[PDB]
Amino acid sequence: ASVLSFERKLDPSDALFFSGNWSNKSDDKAWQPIHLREKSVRGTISNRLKKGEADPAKLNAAIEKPNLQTVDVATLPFDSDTLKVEFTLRVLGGVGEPAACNSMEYRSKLVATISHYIDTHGLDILGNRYAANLANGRFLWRNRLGADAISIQITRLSGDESTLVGVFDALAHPLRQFEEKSVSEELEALAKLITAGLAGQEHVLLRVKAFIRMGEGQEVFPSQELLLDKGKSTKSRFLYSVGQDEKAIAAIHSQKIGNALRTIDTWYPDAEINGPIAVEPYGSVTTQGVAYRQPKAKKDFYSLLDAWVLKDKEPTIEDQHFVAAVLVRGGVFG
Amino acid sequence: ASVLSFERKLDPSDALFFSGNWSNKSDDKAWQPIHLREKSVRGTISNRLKKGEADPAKLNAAIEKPNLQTVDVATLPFDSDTLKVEFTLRVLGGVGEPAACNSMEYRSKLVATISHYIDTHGLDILGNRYAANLANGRFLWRNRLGADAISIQITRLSGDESTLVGVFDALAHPLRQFEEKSVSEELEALAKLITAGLAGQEHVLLRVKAFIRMGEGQEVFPSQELLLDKGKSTKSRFLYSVGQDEKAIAAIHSQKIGNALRTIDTWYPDAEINGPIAVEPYGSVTTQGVAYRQPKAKKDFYSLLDAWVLKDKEPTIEDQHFVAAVLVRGGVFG
Amino acid sequence: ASVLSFERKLDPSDALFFSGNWSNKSDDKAWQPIHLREKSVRGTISNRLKKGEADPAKLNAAIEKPNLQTVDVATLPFDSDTLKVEFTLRVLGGVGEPAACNSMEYRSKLVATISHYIDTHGLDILGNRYAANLANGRFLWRNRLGADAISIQITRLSGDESTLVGVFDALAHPLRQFEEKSVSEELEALAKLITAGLAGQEHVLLRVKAFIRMGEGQEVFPSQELLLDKGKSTKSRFLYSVGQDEKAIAAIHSQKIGNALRTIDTWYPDAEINGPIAVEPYGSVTTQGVAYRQPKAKKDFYSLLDAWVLKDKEPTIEDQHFVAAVLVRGGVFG
């Protein structure tokens, strides 16, 4: 075939953690950054035991060996009760244009297939569900669980201009389904902004500001970084941070914020049982270790695209939406 | 096989130390924070000796040697007799939902059995005993011993509002049994609140303010940090603290506070002599280097949970209380 | 084998220096803190020389190089003739309850062994001998030598109220033996008070106020703080102080006060030849670099404790008092 490779058109930045009180969301200088700290942890024997271990003497022996570790932790201060998560989002047009492609015959029918898809059903639901996942706060991941209150401030930036698009209560919007009426005037302005940017009509740059009321001293949940037994350190858990040594700030990986944004695919076989999942070529969910959209039940990105392009096996309108959502997510495809 | 994880449902913050005088409990300004200090210690040869040597000559050579060390110390001022320990606690619903699950047929039967548990024997005992361990001050660890008077103020935090749940005399509540029929209305209000949170009905954020009258200038006991012989410092003992650099405040580790709340398990084989212990999959007790709840006796959390779910072997109702209590603790199980 | 550790049950605070005149001991606001000062000191070649160094020109040269140092110094004011030393003492029960132990068999007979010892010959003598070391002012250490007078006011505090246990005359009490049979009623009061606290009967909080008349402007003696070329200080002597920065108060280390309280061991082999010593597991004494109770002879703590507990070889009554005495000193016996 061809060795294509599309570029992501959703470009979120890392989301950095900031701490303050709830009554001062509008006051931008009222939010100090959250830095990582280290603390000692006395481990516990909690994993399933091996076949050998069984015997009470060696379980017991295991419990007396110290098992102590050091972990990263990020928390709100004793006097500040509200996490603040800020990141910018860039939506780019050109979703139908490959950035690389090795078969001249394959490129031609692809762009046509997408172009007329764009032409027919304007990719509004793509923008609508992206938009929705800003308003859910789904990109907060573990920080939304247990929140007293979550208010999300979205603005558009152009030059030196900021424009309030919307202030969404993340807990007033569903995570398991997408609202299809009566939405909101403010939500809808933001789905049309993202769709315009997806399409090419506008230059779109958003500034998200999520505010979670967690309670003084409460632990916040940045991303994890994985580099175990790196020599003398031998620290148990490492969190993610941005900005060099003392200044560095706790953050969620940009791609984790992205993974949340594209969790849209309600269009796969078991979609009513498992709710929405994140658009991936093979509808893979890493936690559950299973692939919705298996290749044998031809509903993966790949089988569908050849059908829809190489053979003109037109697919259903939702699966058509899905393969657009992969091209929006993008990635080397071969 | 099934591989799966559960996230904590009881979420206490670090517990920070403050100082002041017992009269001014209600005045929140009257409490200045406790910072760590360093002090020299001329050490003693106090450990058990090896083969080389119990010879008189080399023992005495060893005592001649200076053996000076530096240690962190936290203590009350010369003019302040009471230690304040403050922390907030969040209680999350969703006990039965695993955070990650490998096999979704195992999830189905797991969420099935736990949901049945919640409906039948409502998790009232769990919130009964978590509540108790707040009301008795078990979370004060070594700071409870010898206290003149411990008064524990607990309050519900709901957006901007703060409502007082109860003021508890921690020396009036047992640490070896959990109280019966006539609990107290204040304790009972609190135990309901924790189970509503455990059960998803309410958003519960509590603020524990614990006052221990100890006497002016008396040493207090934060957590320890285990970094012994790291660097040229040659420091004998590190203590735990939270907050930037010099204004950092001495603290108990959040997970030490949660070990206290989870000391509810009176359901293991020898419990009537040993007393309650903190919930742990293999019923482990680190200070005694022994694992109650051995796998030989199939009383460990895995024997229990496997049986209950894969083979529909109902365990004794106390043992059911235990694995539900493990599930709120959380861990990585598989 | 056992990996026990006992928490200390004698808990004195740091002792802080104040200064005033001898008439006003009863006026608490008539005493003002002693802050440390720096002064310059031109050194002197006073140590023993080393082969090479003994040549005349070499030592002659050694004399002429400045040798200039800075030292901390604490003194009474020009108008204030009396040093006042205040600390608070907590006495805890639970002597025979280890805070940690590894082998379940060892805890078993240990608690029985110690329990019975308490049951039989009650630890009155331990209380008597601590008691006396408050009354002889041993804890004043170098501030005791060459004093016009020494008045030690002891009170017990409970709640908001203080009861005068006694006013002792530390120079009318011996250091080198403990007084024979006939002892003051007030000393008797205090020895019963410490034993009740060691036993568990009462909550014991004492406030010791020692007054030493030494003459206007005289140098007082706090503990020493020992750091070796920490920074570019080149300050040869540092003393201990407690408090913020420049209103920190000269002090004796708490554990120095404690070591003086447990100066009770008249029970080693050479006890008539050397008098009392502070209770250490191997009867060590830092100044003399000697280990009384060497382990060759089976009179150290640990040889004794295994014999008395493991093999039921009960030891001499006086050495049983010692073994109990280490247990209230406490500390990791690894």
Author numbering:
A (entry chain E), B (entry chain F), C (entry chain G): 10 to 343
Question: What do the paper's sentences say?
Answer:
In the type I-F system, several Csy genes comprise a silencing Cascade complex with the Csy3 protein as a backbone-forming molecule. Among them, four genes of Csy1, -2, -3, and -4 (ZmCsy1-4) appear to form a silencing Cascade complex in the type I-F CRISPR systems. Based on the P. aeruginosa Cascade complex with a protein-helical backbone of six Csy3s, ZmCsy3 is predicted to form the molecular-helical backbone of the Z. mobilis Cascade complex. In order to provide a clue for the assembly mechanism of the Cascade silencing complex of the type I CRISPR/Cas system, the crystal structure of ZmCsy3 was determined.
There are seven ZmCsy3 molecules (ZmCsy3.1–ZmCsy3.7) in the asymmetric unit, and their structures superimpose very well onto each other, with a root-mean-square-deviation (rmsd) value of less than 0.2 Å. The monomeric ZmCsy3 structure is composed of ten α-helices (α1-α10) and eight β-strands (β1–β8) and forms a right-handed glove that is composed of a finger of several α-helices, a palm consisting of a β-sheet of 6 β-strands with an extended region (web), a thumb composed of a two-stranded β-sheet and an α-helix, and the backside of glove. The surface potential map reveals a positively charged surface patch within the glove and the inner sides of a finger and the thumb, and negatively charged surface patches on the backside of the glove and the outside of a finger and a thumb. The seven ZmCsy3 molecules in the asymmetric unit form an inter-molecular helical structure. At the inter-subunit interface, a thumb of one subunit interacts with a finger of the neighboring subunit, and the β-sheet of the five β-strands on the backside of one subunit comes into contact with those of the neighboring subunit(s) through many polar and hydrophilic interactions. In this oligomeric structure, the concave palms are twisted within a single molecule and form a continuous hollow cleft along the molecular helix, together with the extended regions (webs) and several loops in the fingers, and expose a long positively charged cleft to the solvent. The inter-molecular helix formed by seven ZmCsy3 molecules is part of a long superhelical filament structure in the entire crystal system, where seven molecules form a single turn with a diameter of ∼95 Å and a length of ∼82 Å. Since this molecular-helical structure is formed in the absence of crRNA in the crystalline state, there is a possibility that ZmCsy3 can be aggregated at high protein concentrations to form a molecular helical backbone of the Cascade effector complex without crRNA. The hexameric molecular-helix formed by ZmCsy3s, except for one ZmCsy3 subunit at either end in the apo-backbone structure, superimposes well onto the PaCsy3 helix backbone in the holo-Cascade structure, with rmsd values of less than 2.51 Å among the aligned 1912 Ca atoms, and only a negligible difference at the crRNA binding regions.
